[PDB]
Swiss-Prot record:
Subcellular location as annotated: Cytoplasm; Cytoplasm, Cytoskeleton; Mitochondrion; Cytoplasm, Cytoskeleton, Microtubule organizing center, Centrosome
Tissue-by-tissue expression: Expressed in granule cell precursors within the dentate migratory stream during the first week of postnatal life and in differentiated granule cells of the hippocampus (at protein level). Detected in heart, brain, kidney, and testis. Expressed in dentate gyrus, hippocampus and in the olfactory bulb.
Result after altering residue 58 to Q: Abolished interaction with ATF4
Residues shown, of full length: 765 to 852 of 852
PTM note: Ubiquitinated. Ubiquitination with 'Lys-48'-linked polyubiquitin chains leads to its proteasomal degradation.
Chain's role: Involved in the regulation of multiple aspects of embryonic and adult neurogenesis. Required for neural progenitor proliferation in the ventrical/subventrical zone during embryonic brain development and in the adult dentate gyrus of the hippocampus. Participates in the Wnt-mediated neural progenitor proliferation as a positive regulator by modulating GSK3B activity and CTNNB1 abundance.
Span list, region Disordered: 69-88
Superkingdom of this protein's organism: Eukaryota
Region span, Interaction with NDEL1: 38-71
Taxonomic path: Eukaryota, Metazoa, Chordata, Craniata, Vertebrata
Location of the region described as Interaction with NDEL1 and PAFAH1B1 in the Swiss-Prot/TrEMBL record: 1-88
Source organism: Mus musculus
Gene name for this UniProt entry: Disc1
Protein name, as recorded: Disrupted in schizophrenia 1 homolog
């Protein structure tokens, strides 16, 4: 009769999965600070593979619980006028050297964690506890 295995066990399985991603996120943040300050090669490879596996599993989780449509989808345009221009004259770098290669990776990883945090917060808020009547 039944074709699918998951029908009732989905709301009780998300809580444990969310707690697992939370403990992994905290351990990944501590290992990220220790790997960037101490500088390593093995820790960066393991961090990239673990981050890609958590991102792929998180995308599959949101694609499994939340349905997807083929026809439709809204596109963004964002209005612009053009006010105030930014110009570079003094890079500034006191200490030992200059930071440019580490800044790009720090902003890219920080943006990926911000989107990852908003995604986990949206699934937690939508399923589990509801706000207002």
């Amino acid at each position: 009769g039944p074709w699918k295995e998951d029908s009732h066990i989905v709301s009780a399985e998300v809580g444990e999965k969310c707690e697992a991603i939370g403990v992994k996120l905290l351990h990944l943040e501590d290992q990220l600070l220790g790997a960037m300050y101490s500088h390593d090669e093995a820790l960066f490879q393991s961090l990239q593979g673990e981050l890609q596996t958590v991102k792929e599993t998180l995308q599959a989780m949101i694609l499994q619980l939340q349905p997807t449509k083929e026809a439709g989808e809204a596109s963004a345009s964002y209005p612009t006028a053009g006010a105030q221009e930014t110009e570079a004259l003094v890079p500034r770098g006191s200490g030992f050297g200059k930071n440019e290669a580490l800044k790009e990776k720090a902003d890219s990883l920080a943006k990926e964690i911000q989107y990852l945090k908003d995604l986990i917060e949206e699934v937690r808020k939508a399923r589990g506890k509801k706000r207002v009547p």
